[PDB]
Amino acid sequence: SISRFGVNTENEDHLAKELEDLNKWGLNIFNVAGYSHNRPLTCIMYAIFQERDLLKTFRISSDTFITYMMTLEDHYHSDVAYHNSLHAADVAQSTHVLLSTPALDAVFTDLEILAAIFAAAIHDVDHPGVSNQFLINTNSELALMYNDESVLENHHLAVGFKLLQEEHCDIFMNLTKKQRQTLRKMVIDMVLATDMSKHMSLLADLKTMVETKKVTSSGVLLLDNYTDRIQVLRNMVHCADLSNPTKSLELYRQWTDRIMEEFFQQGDKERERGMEISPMCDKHTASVEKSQVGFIDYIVHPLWETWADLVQPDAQDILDTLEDNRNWYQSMIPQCQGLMEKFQF
């Protein structure tokens, strides 16, 4: 069971049936959690690494891998409504699918692939369930440590890398020095690019890149160098981090409930401290359906449209689902600055 899934489970057969969808956008990670004793991140990372032969390629012990992943998953907070191990697992599995998009076939090195999925796994570790801006506004120790810049993203990185230095946790021991160095650099790059306040400038740079794209006669992207590759990978991970609205409505709605609960819990903190309640964080004046439509139309669609343009035609299904979900939320609205502000500056 451990050998098969990297986790103990009372229903191996149900877990195995769900993991049949490992390479699919339609994987249901909530079910994976339910059949893995709420170890979705360890489970999904083990599955992904076996699928891609990454433990063989990089000589990573499977036991050491399970040990690291368990401590990493333990460092996600169960009582944080959205930014917990289920979201990390989702981003990792979503990154895993995006890496296999036909337009990117054989484009990336194995180390690049390793770096993207590892980054996905660690990108929100030890999230406190309050935003960067909250941490800045409350004079937090983390904001003081990190000089107000990508405060949590720097913290997620430091925690993720520090766990590797625990006894029996160094999954990269068998990499060469040069490999370790390159991997570190790439992971730092990608996790720092998940700072939502970089969304606009990241999208601008991606469009610029997409203007210059060239493909083979088979539709495969031609990337000139490292610089172009890591740019696609940053953006890939960002897209995986804003993929909830591109999943089935059933899944999207569960994600939305969770991020609203998280925001509302921060707004209750802010209220208790006599602070102005941040946009999206006031449960008494929230308009959830309307905000999702604006989120999609101004942030998530523009990003996915640029991504879809890059990997044309691979991502049309994703765009169609996103539109369809937008239509649903729009139909459920009962009879702009706060939005856009979390995604720029």
Ligand SMILES: CCc1c(C)nc(-c2ccc(Cl)s2)nc1Nc1ccc(CC(=O)O)cc1
């Ligand atoms: C993908 C889940 C998701 C959904 C479904 N909706 C929204 C927002 C809707 C309206 C809005 Cl303003 S944010 N944000 C989401 N994620 C998210 C996560 C973190 C942050 C950083 C921050 O707190 O500033 C911003 C957005």
Ligand SMILES: [Mg+2]
């Ligand atoms: Mg984050």
Ligand code: NA
């Ligand atoms: Na935990």
Ligand SMILES: [Zn+2]
């Ligand atoms: Zn995230």
